[PDB]
Design a protein around this ligand. Structure first.
Ligand SMILES: Cc1c(C(=O)C(N)=O)c2c(OCC(=O)O)cccc2n1Cc1cccc2ccccc12
Ligand SMILES: [Ca+2]
Ligand SMILES: [Cl-]
Length: 123
């Protein structure tokens, strides 16, 4: 489930994984309408990533993988290809979060779902 991804987020962003829970309109379970900012797009893309893995027969919500963080980046591993794929989806998201640290806004943390409006952009 969520333990490894939370650890990855904390390592790459310096924030608790709680700070990306219910962030904007996409971070947290599900999501809909238009992303509020770049961080939120990371989560929209991550949702898309997981949907791709589900079509491949993986269960990314549950897969347990292994990873380390050296200086040259995040190294992903696991017994199965589905575990390694899930790690790749998470990696891209954690890197996306880090890259957009400059526009992270606390006002979007724990965002009320009523404030999510507009169309839902496709994957
Ligand atoms: C950032 C994020 C997520 C995403 O990347 C996203 N795209 O929605 C995420 C998440 O995404 C998958 C989904 O939308 O089904 C589900 C639950 C918590 C999530 N979180 C928050 C979160 C991430 C990692 C570890 C957590 C541990 C405890 C509580 C919340 C945690
Ligand atoms: Ca989501
Ligand atoms: Cl295993």
């Amino acid at each position: 489930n969520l333990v490894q991804f939370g650890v990855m987020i904390e390592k790459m962003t310096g924030k608790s994984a709680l700070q990306y829970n219910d962030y904007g309109c996409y971070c947290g379970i599900g999501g809909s309408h238009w992303p509020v900012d770049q961080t939120d797009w990371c989560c929209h893309a991550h949702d898309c990533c997981y949907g791709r893995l589900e079509k491949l027969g993986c269960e990314p919500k549950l897969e347990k993988y292994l990873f380390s963080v050296s200086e040259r980046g995040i190294f992903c591993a696991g017994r199965t290809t589905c575990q390694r794929l899930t790690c790749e989806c998470d990696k891209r998201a954690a890197l996306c979060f880090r890259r957009n640290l400059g526009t992270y806004n606390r006002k979007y943390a724990h965002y009320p779902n009523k404030l999510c409006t507009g169309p839902t952009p496709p994957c």
